[PDB]
Write a protein that binds this DNA or RNA. Structure first.
Length: 259
DNA sequence: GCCTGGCGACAGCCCACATGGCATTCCACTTATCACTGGCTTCGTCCGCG
């Protein structure tokens, strides 16, 4: 069976502190563990990186951010723990595996159920596949002309590398076109219309440092005190199309990652 | 052959201005006008044509 894991499979290009020659691609778990070692991890698509730094800020960061500044001058104490871990200069791998451990079997995007940032049921109710060309950026869609980025005629399209596929999926989850995508029925409801992505047409500002760990630490908005939150992949069960997108005072609702 | 010199006689000098004047009014516009088109998505439905 096909399987890919963000934690173990290599997709994230990584640059080391030394030499600055031959960046190697690594998984998400490895980057997390070897963070002080690497200066940065890079994605060729700025949309892909714009959502990427958002999700990476919810993993390493969440564990370090703690999701809980109650009493004690909240802002002051989070900045105190912040100074404490910033002083350590690194994250203990055992707390990473523990986080990964909670949902270790839930990451491999190609999951039959619970695929990464995806809806698995979707396959059954949509008659026409959008196609890779409609998903991937710089790639021509059905109505798009054949002039740029290699010519894709939408007949025998060359498949995206799985690592490549991951970058695109993440971008479309951030930036995404609005109106007239392919309709899927849900108990009688068919509406090809689609609204735009949450950050669409914007510049995301991520502070950097000398090493990875620094940036990841300095990348988390301070979560105000509020309801405990979780991510789309931290959701216990699927949302369903109908109904209200519930609010989320937690930072996962402030990383625009609740839904 | 090349280079240089020569081919009646053909003028000279002095002289060169002062003074005065040089314009002024006036007049200087209005009206109307000032483009369109497109370079998004997929799909579905309708209308026209065969």
């Amino acid at each position: 069976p096909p399987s890919f894991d963000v934690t173990i499979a290599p997709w994230l290009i990584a640059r080391s502190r030394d030499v600055l020659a031959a960046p190697e691609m690594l998984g998400l778990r490895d980057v997390l563990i070897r963070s002080h070692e690497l200066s940065d991890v890079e994605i060729p698509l700025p949309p892909g990186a714009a959502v990427l730094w958002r999700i990476l800020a919810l993993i390493t960061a969440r564990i370090t951010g703690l999701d809980q500044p109650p009493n004690k001058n909240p802002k002051r104490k989070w900045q105190a723990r912040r100074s404490q871990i910033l002083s350590k200069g690194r994250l203990d791998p055992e707390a990473v595996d523990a986080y990964f451990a909670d949902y270790s079997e839930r990451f491999d995007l190609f999951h039959p159920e619970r695929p990464w940032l995806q809806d698995p049921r979707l396959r059954e109710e949509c008659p026409k596949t959008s196609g890779v060309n409609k998903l991937a950026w710089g790639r021509t869609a059905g109505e798009n002309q054949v002039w740029l980025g290699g010519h894709h005629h939408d007949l025998d399209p060359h498949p995206l590398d799985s690592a490549e596929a991951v970058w695109h999926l993440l971008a479309t989850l951030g930036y995404g076109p609005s109106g007239m995508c392919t309709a899927r029925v849900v108990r009688g409801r068919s509406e090809r219309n689609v609204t735009a992505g949450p950050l669409r047409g914007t510049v995301s500002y991520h502070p950097l440092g000398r090493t990875l760990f620094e940036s990841l630490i300095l990348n988390i908005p301070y979560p105000g005190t509020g309801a405990a939150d979780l991510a789309f992949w931290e959701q216990p069960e699927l949302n369903d199309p109908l109904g209200l997108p519930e609010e989320s005072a937690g930072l996962a609702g402030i990383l625009r990652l609740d839904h």
